[PDB]
């Protein structure tokens, strides 16, 4: 009616090719998916999962692990609805017994001094919360009244028990939902003691240190085996080059997670040519451990891409020895500076030792 398409012409057109616009936004998006995010939020599509049945315990568990403002709303609604539901049925019993009827001293009501639904709401509040003023109270010979009083008390006890349990476990567990572990955005490959080393920096933002910190580093690559095996995300564990060869690390001041790339190390063939963004060469560093205060084991994974690895760079020294204590300049924590270093391949570096 009020549209330009009152009659559609549908006439053919002859417009020559003009594809590329001024904006390069059409081809600008070229990001490649990663199975572990920088912030440690791994995201892998678990598509086509067999439908495991759902149980009411999952809903109950979801109540326990809810947030603080949501828990207050759930329990306030639970308390208010419980009082309101029982006030409604209290009103029914009084109505069905003639208590709500106009004044008559002959009969004894099932609940004394119950007149309107407002009194019924107040009576349910007094019974469930156990205030029990006594102006409105239960009487005898009304078996339904005794039965509902038992039901309301039993229901009130179970509701209160759930609230205490939910509150009790909230303070215990929700305190351990904070991740104060920071890695470096970009890792480096430097030349320490003559041997190439892949290094990254990790620090602790909480005064209480992580007890028994274990570090796990894994190279993820679609490594097709020479025999014919093909695996999309094969994980190769990498040693730590620690003082004892173990995975224990002390976290007081941030340190460099340096691993010497040797023949055993899969990074023996690492090159800046294969350092581009579209190369399947990704490092995963995981520092597990238990925080002393609470006792819950904590994990903080991080993923380093080839493009996020800066070849031939050195981490800035951090800890300055002041007169009394040690100064940590966390502003320059993950800042890497260049240094004159060999830029060949660690596999090709074996020739330098052979030549010398």
């Amino acid at each position: 009616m009020l549209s330009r398409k009152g009659i559609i012409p549908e006439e053919y057109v002859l417009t020559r090719l003009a594809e590329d616009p001024t904006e390069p936004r059409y081809r600008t998006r070229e990001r490649r998916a990663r199975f572990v995010s920088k912030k440690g939020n791994c995201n892998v599509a678990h598509k086509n999962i067999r439908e495991q049945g759902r149980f009411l315990q999952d809903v109950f568990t979801t109540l326990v692990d809810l947030k603080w403002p949501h828990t207050l709303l759930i329990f306030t609604m639970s308390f208010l609805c419980s009082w309101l539901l029982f006030a409604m049925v209290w009103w029914l019993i009084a109505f069905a017994h003639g208590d709500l009827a106009p004044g008559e001293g002959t009969n004894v009501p099932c609940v004394t001094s119950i007149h309107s639904f407002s009194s019924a709401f107040l009576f349910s509040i007094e019974v469930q919360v156990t205030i029990g003023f006594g102006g409105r109270m239960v009487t005898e010979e009304c078996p339904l009244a005794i039965l509902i009083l038992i039901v309301q008390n039993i229901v009130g006890l179970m509701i209160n028990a759930i609230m205490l349990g939910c509150i009790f476990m909230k303070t215990a567990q929700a305190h351990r939902r904070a991740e104060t572990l920071i890695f470096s955005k970009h890792a480096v490959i430097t030349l320490r003691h003559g041997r190439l080393c892949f290094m990254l920096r990790v620090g602790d933002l909480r005064k209480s240190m992580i007890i028994s910190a274990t570090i796990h580093m894994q190279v993820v690559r679609k490594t097709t085996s020479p025999e014919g095996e093909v695996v999309p995300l094969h994980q190769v564990d990498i040693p730590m080059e620690n003082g004892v060869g173990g995975n224990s690390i002390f976290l007081v001041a941030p340190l460099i997670i340096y691993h010497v790339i040797d023949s055993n190390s899969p990074l023996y063939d690492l090159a800046p040519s294969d350092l581009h963004h579209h190369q399947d060469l990704e490092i995963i560093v995981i520092l597990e451990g238990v925080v002393e205060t609470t006792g819950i084991t904590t994990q903080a994974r991080t993923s380093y891409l080839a493009d996020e690895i800066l070849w031939g760079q050195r981490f800035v020294p951090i800890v300055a020895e002041e007169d009394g204590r040690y100064s940590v300049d966390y502003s320059k924590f993950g800042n890497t500076v260049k240094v004159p270093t060999p830029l060949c391949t660690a596999r090709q570096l074996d020739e330098d030792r052979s030549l010398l």
Binding site: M1, L2, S3, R4
Partner: protein
């Protein structure tokens, strides 16, 4: 009115989107109108400074400088040369940095950081671009014919003379074809020039001489210039040159450039030595080596 509010609001939004889409068409055309224009006409007195038509074919150069892709202009830098009427000043140099240097700068349709060109004493640069090109016959490289009146393709819009130019052009090339051409004076049905060959358009370029009595030819040979067609082209050109014309030729064909009175071998904006026999091919060790 409340009932109709619903559909009114929907169609106001829908038509607004349509106008937003269709107002981008005017935006695109305004971008096209924002393009620059070089020069409508020059700054000179049209009374006596110019002449009716340069039928001589003599050009004078005063430190010619050419420019294209202003970031770098390695072509035709401070080159000075003199024009001899009726001769064949061939131009053929490096394929990459010396082939189309002089050709681009000839018709003033390109930039020039410096330079000074005068034709027979009149100021070529100071004269209008259309006025300068009105009396400068040229030749093409690829066969292009404007569909429509084929006579209008050859004869000018003014059409000062029809039969004389028609007969002279026929004698120059394809006398039987031109005389027996069913198009005639009108020749409206060009049909994209399927009947005509590649070299036929070159005669139409030469028709400008019979059209405008222009001595200077801006020639160029490419796109399967056969030996027989070139010989017919050469025969017409030398006949015209003997009477009044002046020949200027630029091509990469070795045979066409070999039979040249002079040479203007250009490489990266530098012109090699010019001598009478093939620019002294026997003595020179550069042009002769590349020739074979």
């Amino acid at each position: 009115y409340a009932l109709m509010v619903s559909n009114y609001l929907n169609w106001m939004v829908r038509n607004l989107a349509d106008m937003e889409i269709q107002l981008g068409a005017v935006k695109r055309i305004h971008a096209l109108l924002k393009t620059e224009a070089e020069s409508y006409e020059g700054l000179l007195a049209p009374s006596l400074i110019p002449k009716n038509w340069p039928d001589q074919g003599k050009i004078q150069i005063q430190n010619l400088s050419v420019r294209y892709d202003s970031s770098l202009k390695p072509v035709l830098k401070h080159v000075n040369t003199l024009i001899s009427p009726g001769q064949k000043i061939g131009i053929c140099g490096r394929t990459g940095s010396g082939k189309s240097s002089f050709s681009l700068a000839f018709f003033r349709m390109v930039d020039m950081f410096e330079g000074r060109i005068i034709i027979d004493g009149i100021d070529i640069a100071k004269l209008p671009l259309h006025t300068l090109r009105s009396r400068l016959s040229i030749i093409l490289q690829d066969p292009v014919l404007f569909s429509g009146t084929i006579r209008f393709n050859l004869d000018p819009e003014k059409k000062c003379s029809d039969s004389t130019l028609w007969e002279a052009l026929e004698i120059a090339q394809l006398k039987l074809v031109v005389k027996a051409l069913p198009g005639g004076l009108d020749a409206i049905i060009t049909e994209g020039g399927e009947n005509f060959s590649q070299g036929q358009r070159q005669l139409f370029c030469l028709a400008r001489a019979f059209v405008r009595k222009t001595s200077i030819f801006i020639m160029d040979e490419a796109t399967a210039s056969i030996d027989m067609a070139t010989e017919n082209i050469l025969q017409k050109v030398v006949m015209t040159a003997f009477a009044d014309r002046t020949v200027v030729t630029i091509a990469h064909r070795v045979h066409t450039i070999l039979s040249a009175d002079l040479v203007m071998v250009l490489k990266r904006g530098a012109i090699l030595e010019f001598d009478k026999p093939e620019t002294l091919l026997s003595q020179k060790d550069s042009v002769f080596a590349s020739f074979v």
